[PDB]
Amino acid sequence: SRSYSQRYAKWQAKFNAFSNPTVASTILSNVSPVAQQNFQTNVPKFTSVNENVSAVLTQYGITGPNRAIYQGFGLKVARALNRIGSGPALVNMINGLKGYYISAFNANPQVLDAVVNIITGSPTGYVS
DNA sequence: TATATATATATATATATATATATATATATATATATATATATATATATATATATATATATATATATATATATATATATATATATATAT
């Protein structure tokens, strides 16, 4: 276990280390092509979500930051999908997620279902 | 010891020719400048008057696009760390 004093102390030491020209460049240049792979591998998956969800939002007349609300929701759905996969667990996730957005951010349930209807292909609850 | 010839100089006497300068007298031509008088042309600037075009900036008014940051609101992805929980 670690107290704040300890949390910070070590954080500082590592931050300092990293800031060193040679340390930063050593690490970053070594993980360059690796990171590139990872970025390329997963990012396109979410871009397509942003696109399709955007299309939906335009059909629903959603503008400004309100689009951003639903986009965040959609992205979250996709995230869970990637880290969990479709089926039961995803259903459990989406149900809670909807509750989160509906009541915490006053997102419109109906539109939220429209978002799910794209990413998953249908509203949740039932697997299909 | 003298004389002669051939070259390298210096002088005594004047003259001539050829080059390198300086002056006395004016004029002419050709170049390198400076001025007196105006005008013209061509370039290098500065100003008086406005306008136009092209570039280098600053602002007044809003909007748009492209990059460099900071924040407001959440979410996502990718990397750099710290922790909460176990493996």
Per DSSP, A121 falls in state S
Residue A62 φ then ψ, to 5°: -85, 125
Per DSSP, A61 falls in state T
Q: Residue A47 is part of which domain span?
A: 43-128
Q: Are A86 and A119 in contact (CB under 8 A)?
A: no
Resolution (A): 3.8
Residue closest to A113 by CA, chosen among A64, A53, A51: A53
Residue A86 φ then ψ, to 5°: -70, 165
Strand B–CB A104 distance below 7 A: no
Method: cryo-EM
CATH code at position A52: 1.20.58.800
Tokens coding A68: 């951003």
Distances (CA, A) of A49 to A66, A76, A123: 16, 10, 16
> Helix or strand or coil: residue A57?
helix
Spatial distance from the CA of A102 to the C1' of B53 (Å):
62
Residue A106 φ then ψ, to 5°: 60, 40
Strand B–CB A68 distance below 7 A: yes
Count of residues for chain A? 128
Closest-lying nucleotide for A2 based on CA to C1':
B83
What residues contact A111, with CB distance under 8 A and at least 6 apart?
Answer: A56, A57, A60, A62, A70
